[PDB]
């Protein structure tokens, strides 16, 4: 076989900032060729790619709107670094809505970025990946799919759908492509979160600590390195999904 990292081109969606960037830089530093997909963060993406290449790694930037036609995205990437073998579906939209005031326009976007696009890209990767190569899809989801609540209604349904799809994609794409997932908990402040709000939330986690950014790339590599694993998720969440103390107790 030939599963050495130099022969495992990676596509990370929304890879130019924050968690996506941490994954990109971890994989690139371990010798994976990496395609950094981005949209609004082109400047950042190019900077990351330049640094990797100057350090002797292998990186490129691809640009696409994951709510438009994404049927060309895998090919943009493979044209640069070779057939995509490891797909990280990291890109996301995290907007609040609730029952009683649902806007089907925002609903549609959530399902576009978290469900439609990841499935389409997994489909496209499979079609283009040579038959003598095994592949891996890692979906970046959200710990809340393991502890359902009514907040962020359409967001939550779209992320939970991605977790459901992690199972059914794993079943559909086996044996050649494995599909696993990471469910982050509080990792970086969520735009609507001030630092104090983030720190307080973390202090309330069962483990009282946030996942460290290196854990994300380590987990992608863990899935890559242990070939008996498919259809499964690790919550890098400080135990958030196991929180249990509700007012009724
Ligand atoms: N941060 C946390 O603590 C946390 C907690 C739970 C779950 N998660 C999940 O972990 C993953 C990473 O978190 P994050 O906070 O780092 O994500 P993010 O910053 O909110 O966004 C990541 C990327 O998604 C891309 N994106 C969104 N819509 C796009 C579109 N139509 N077309 C192309 N790109 C689009 C963007 O790329 P461009 O910027 O280039 O446009 C954006 O940079 C996400 O899936 C998130 O849902 C994170």
Numbering used by the authors: 6 to 254
Direct quotes from the study:
Here, we present the crystal structures of FolM alternative dihydro­folate reductase 1 from two Brucella species, B. suis (BsFolM) and B. canis (BcFolM). BsFolM and BcFolM are 95% identical in sequence.
The interface interactions are mostly hydrogen bonds and other nonbonded contacts. The tetramers are similar and superpose with an r.m.s.d. of ∼0.5 Å. Apart from this loop region, the cofactor-binding cavity is very similar in these enzymes. While the substrates of BsFolM and BcFolM are unknown, their substrate-binding cavities are large enough to accommodate the inhibitors identified by rational therapeutics discovery for human African trypanosomiasis and Chagas disease.
